[PDB]
Amino acid sequence: LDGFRKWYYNAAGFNKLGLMRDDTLHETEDVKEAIRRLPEDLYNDRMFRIKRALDLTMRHQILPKDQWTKYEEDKFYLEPYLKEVIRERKEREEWAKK
Amino acid sequence: SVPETQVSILDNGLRVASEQSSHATCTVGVWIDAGSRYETEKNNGAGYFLEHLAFKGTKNRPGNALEKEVESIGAHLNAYSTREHTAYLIKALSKDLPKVVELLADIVQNSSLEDSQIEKERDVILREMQENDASMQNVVFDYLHATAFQGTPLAQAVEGPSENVRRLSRTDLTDYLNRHYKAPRMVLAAAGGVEHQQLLDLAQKHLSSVSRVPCRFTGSEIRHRDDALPLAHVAIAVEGPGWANPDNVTLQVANAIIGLCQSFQTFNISYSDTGLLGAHFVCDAMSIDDMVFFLQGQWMRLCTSATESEVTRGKNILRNALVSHLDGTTPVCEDIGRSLLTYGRRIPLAEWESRIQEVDAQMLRDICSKYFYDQCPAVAGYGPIEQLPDYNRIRSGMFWL
Amino acid sequence: AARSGPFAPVLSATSRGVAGAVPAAPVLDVQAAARPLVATVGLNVPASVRF
Amino acid sequence: QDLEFTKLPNGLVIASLENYAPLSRIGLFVKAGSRYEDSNNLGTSHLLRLASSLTTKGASSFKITRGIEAVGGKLSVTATRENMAYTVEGIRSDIEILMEFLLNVTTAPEFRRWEVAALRSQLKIDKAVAFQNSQTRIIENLHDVAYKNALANPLYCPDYRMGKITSEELHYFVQNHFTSARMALVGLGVSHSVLKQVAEQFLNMRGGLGLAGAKAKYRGGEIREQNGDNLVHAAIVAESAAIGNAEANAFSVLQHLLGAGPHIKNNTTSLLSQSGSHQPFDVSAFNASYSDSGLFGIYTISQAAAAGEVINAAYNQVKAVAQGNLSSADVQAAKNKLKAGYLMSVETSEGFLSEIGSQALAAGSYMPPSTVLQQIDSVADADVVKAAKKFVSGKKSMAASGNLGHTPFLDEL
């Protein structure tokens, strides 16, 4: 399962643009709240990575293979911050339900 | 376990009410059923100007020697006037209970209005009014009262128009004093470390001399546009039920549900079988209309769809707030004086709790539909109020399609 | 002048008249005295000054 | 019965009184005022005071707000230069979760960075609302010119420090001053046992004595700020006694002799107020005593033009009291005013809870209202005179604001 997940990570292809996994999340309301709660350095790296991926998609290029994002290396930075947004979101929802 | 408020009555009709408690300081006050509602537009500032003159000396205690006495025991002397009630209250120690009562007796009868003082208090009152305009929310609530009770004695303010203030004389005052200070319309209320029998004996000794002898809600709006002010104050109200109508309690729970504008306050002002129930908010010009829309939706919501839980919230909120027992002596008595003047009796907190717990969501939305839905409001705006909607838009926001 | 030394532009001000930039250099709803300050704030009750 | 005060072995004071009130109040008192900051973390106590509804380790923000408003209870924070007090009140059937919320807020905050970044704008708004009146600004200026290090720190955050207060500063302040030896948990309308039992779930984390605060040093100085207000709010104070010293009382009797504000809703209510008078002006005596130092002086509001001699007249009156020119009936009336003010301050429930709280942190003991009465009586005429001479001689500190073209200076005063 670990090797097949690495193969699927190579087949997804966002590592060839230098992106992380959390860069590829669709910005819903909860995702934008989690992005707003990021520290300044992580937010700046995320915006630069997104801008570089957009430039590479503009020129129809990819990064060199040494510059790709290694599956093992990818960091799920937004995840911790996101869970909270969802948790808080649900708590609020439940309160209203009841 | 809250001690009951015991009420006695002298021949004069002055109900002497007291509610003893451990606290060693007491708040002894006199309430009088006399306000701007009893004035007839020729003496529109008589109660206010008498409230200024009442501490400037009596016949027995001429001038500042009187207030020297209330400095000597370290007591605090306060007075206020509303559209329906006037109160003169003293916070003191328990052991100074007799002299305080005697002091209050002078303040209600045997009072002396010095002509010299009359000019000095006229300049005080005139000037304060000349600067009172500064307080916007007071201007907005006076405008709301005027446009809601057009043509009635409830439109006119407590202070009165500068005109009357300048044009007032001892005899006029004497009249208001001799007319609206009757013994059956007076309550001697005491709260805190007082004994009821001692207070009754003191009321028999002094104060036993006091002589024994509708409104129409015009739904409309007043707007004072002045664009130089930084913030806008808007009050919207409908007709209230009055003091004696129990659904007030339910309406209070509704206010506790409401509790977008920088400041949003709900009010239920009650007078004798009338009142103003509504909301006052103070906002920047470019937000005003949105506030109004917000506010009307809430009201409409309660009238349209209100859950069980929020009701519980209001019930509880009101409960804690309604809690006044041992909140403060000044409050405690204030409640005794108003309860004997309005209800004719002191409603205990257990009866308030029973009337709160009988309120559910169905009767709350029924009473809110009775008092808010499809009613013509009174609107009073002051400040940059151009984006404040006119009467058709507010009236259309008073119901849902 | 002579007294200026290196503090002239500090003891003197010169408007350009006719011949870093300024870095972009509110309103709240509105006596007694001498009771030491004790500021209070609350979750529900609005904050206040007890001057 | 009466209050009960067990001292726990980790230093926490527990005080309880069960009077079977329908609404019961529970407060927690910490020696963590603004005097414990230095020049590197100014305004941290203001953000800590405004950060009482932030997601705590135990409870999320939504709950800490919706749960207190669900039962209709109240959570408030009152802060002086020495002490902070977090108070909750509500129906007896909901004070268990009210103590859960309050003790979570006191003991285990999280101080998330996005929450404090949202709170700094509220900090600016709260400071503007607080400085909407002239007294607050002139007392803050008076403390800043009167003291050097400790009590000179403002209650409200400075303008440059907004945007600069971090989560780490709040965490450091809490970890260095919210320890059990500086805390008293006081409950009116509750059983002592539960307070003892709610003192174990929390208030057990930090058992230290906290990072003690520097000794406050007097500096003197007069600051005048032209602000335009027609009224020149001027406060002239000097160093006075600490809370505990007997001299303290003497200074309280001295302010009630000189005038402590009006007692009527406005004349001949003060030796000061009496000292000629043909204009609108307010004059009172100011006294603020903290556990190491005190400030006593005069406070004047007046028309700019007369601002001078009015201040001089007030000063001259105190000099008369420094020369023994007083009567025993005046001192007896001052004692009666002071004791009536104390009894009316403790007659309310929240004032009673604050008093017990303060006494706890200050002396660890409860002083029955009665005891105080006889101690105030202890103050005698000469004692009052003595405190006066202290003010009349000690270096003064002056904070002035308004149109100060005719406001005198300290070397002229």
Swiss-Prot record, chain B:
Q: What is this protein called?
A: Cytochrome b-c1 complex subunit 1, mitochondrial
Query: Could you tell me which residues carry N6-succinyllysine?
Result: K120
Return the SUPFAM superfamilies for the record: LuxS/MPP-like metallohydrolase (SSF63411)
Q: Where in the cell is it found?
A: Mitochondrion inner membrane
KW Chloroplast (keyword) present = no
Question: Which modifications occur after translation, per UniProt?
Answer: Acetylation of Lys-95 is observed in liver mitochondria from fasted mice but not from fed mice.
Give the UniProt family note: Belongs to the peptidase M16 family. UQCRC1/QCR1 subfamily.
Transmembrane region positions? none
Q: Name one Pfam family in it.
A: Peptidase_M16
Which parts of the sequence carry N6-acetyllysine? K68, K95, K120, K205
> Which organism does this record belong to?
Mus musculus (Mouse)
* One term under GO cellular component: mitochondrion
- Phosphothreonine modified-residue sites: T171
Q: In which tissues is it expressed?
A: Expressed in neurons and astrocytes of the cerebral cortex and hippocampus (at protein level).
Q: Which InterPro entries match?
A: Metalloenz_LuxS/M16 (IPR011249), MPP/UQCRC_Complex (IPR050361), Pept_M16_N (IPR011765), Peptidase_M16_C (IPR007863)
Where, per the database record, does this protein carry Phosphoserine?
S169
Q: Which GO terms describe its molecular function?
A: metal ion binding; protein-containing complex binding; ubiquitin protein ligase binding
Reported consequences of knocking out the gene: Results in early embryonic lethality.
Report the SS bond pairs. Answer: none
The annotated subunit structure for this chain is:
Component of the ubiquinol-cytochrome c oxidoreductase (cytochrome b-c1 complex, complex III, CIII), a multisubunit enzyme composed of 11 subunits. The complex is composed of 3 respiratory subunits cytochrome b, cytochrome c1 and Rieske protein UQCRFS1, 2 core protein subunits UQCRC1/QCR1 and UQCRC2/QCR2, and 6 low-molecular weight protein subunits UQCRH/QCR6, UQCRB/QCR7, UQCRQ/QCR8, UQCR10/QCR9, UQCR11/QCR10 and subunit 9, the cleavage product of Rieske protein UQCRFS1.
Which keywords does this Swiss-Prot/TrEMBL entry list? Acetylation, Electron transport, Membrane, Mitochondrion, Mitochondrion inner membrane, Phosphoprotein, Respiratory chain, Transit peptide, Transport
Q: What does this protein do?
A: Component of the ubiquinol-cytochrome c oxidoreductase, a multisubunit transmembrane complex that is part of the mitochondrial electron transport chain which drives oxidative phosphorylation.
Q: Which residues form a coiled coil?
A: none
From Swiss-Prot, chain C:
In terms of superkingdom, the source organism counts as Eukaryota
What is this protein's function per UniProt?
Component of the ubiquinol-cytochrome c oxidoreductase (cytochrome b-c1 complex, complex III, CIII). UQCRFS1 undergoes proteolytic processing once it is incorporated in the complex III dimer. One of the fragments, called subunit 9, corresponds to its mitochondrial targeting sequence (MTS). The proteolytic processing is necessary for the correct insertion of UQCRFS1 in the complex III dimer, but the persistence of UQCRFS1-derived fragments may prevent newly imported UQCRFS1 to be processed and assembled into complex III and is detrimental for the complex III structure and function.
Subunit comment for this entry?
Answer: Component of the ubiquinol-cytochrome c oxidoreductase (cytochrome b-c1 complex, complex III, CIII). Subunit 9 corresponds to the mitochondrial targeting sequence (MTS) of Rieske protein UQCRFS1. It is retained after processing and incorporated inside complex III, where it remains bound to the complex and localizes between the 2 core subunits UQCRC1/QCR1 and UQCRC2/QCR2.
Can you name this protein? Answer: Cytochrome b-c1 complex subunit 9
Q: Which species expresses this protein natively?
A: Mus musculus (Mouse)
- Annotated gene: Uqcrfs1
From Swiss-Prot, chain D:
What does the UniProt PTM comment say about this protein? Acetylation of Lys-124 and Lys-215 is observed in liver mitochondria from fasted mice but not from fed mice.
UniProt modified residues of type Phosphoserine: S328
Q: Indicate what this protein is called per its UniProt record.
A: Cytochrome b-c1 complex subunit 2, mitochondrial
Q: Which GO terms describe its molecular function?
A: metal ion binding; metalloendopeptidase activity; protein-containing complex binding
Pfam families listed in its UniProt record = Peptidase_M16, Peptidase_M16_C
Keyword Transport in record: yes
Q: Which PROSITE patterns does the entry mention? A: INSULINASE
Q: How does it sit in the membrane?
A: Peripheral membrane protein
Where does the entry say this protein is expressed, by tissue?
Expressed in neurons and astrocytes of the cerebral cortex and hippocampus (at protein level).
Gene3D superfamilies assigned to the protein according to its UniProt record, in alphabetical order: Metalloenzyme, LuxS/M16 peptidase-like
Q: Recite the UniProt keywords alphabetically.
A: Acetylation, Electron transport, Membrane, Mitochondrion, Mitochondrion inner membrane, Phosphoprotein, Respiratory chain, Transit peptide, Transport
Localization in the cell: Mitochondrion inner membrane
Q: Which GO terms describe its cellular component?
A: mitochondrial inner membrane; mitochondrion; myelin sheath; nucleoplasm; respiratory chain complex III
Task: Please provide the Gene Ontology terms (biological process) for this protein.
Answer: cellular respiration; mitochondrial electron transport, ubiquinol to cytochrome c; proteolysis; response to xenobiotic stimulus
Name the family the entry cites: Belongs to the peptidase M16 family. UQCRC2/QCR2 subfamily.
Q: Which InterPro entries match?
A: Metalloenz_LuxS/M16, MPP/UQCRC_Complex, Pept_M16_N, Pept_M16_Zn_BS, Peptidase_M16_C
Q: Does the keyword NADP apply?
A: no
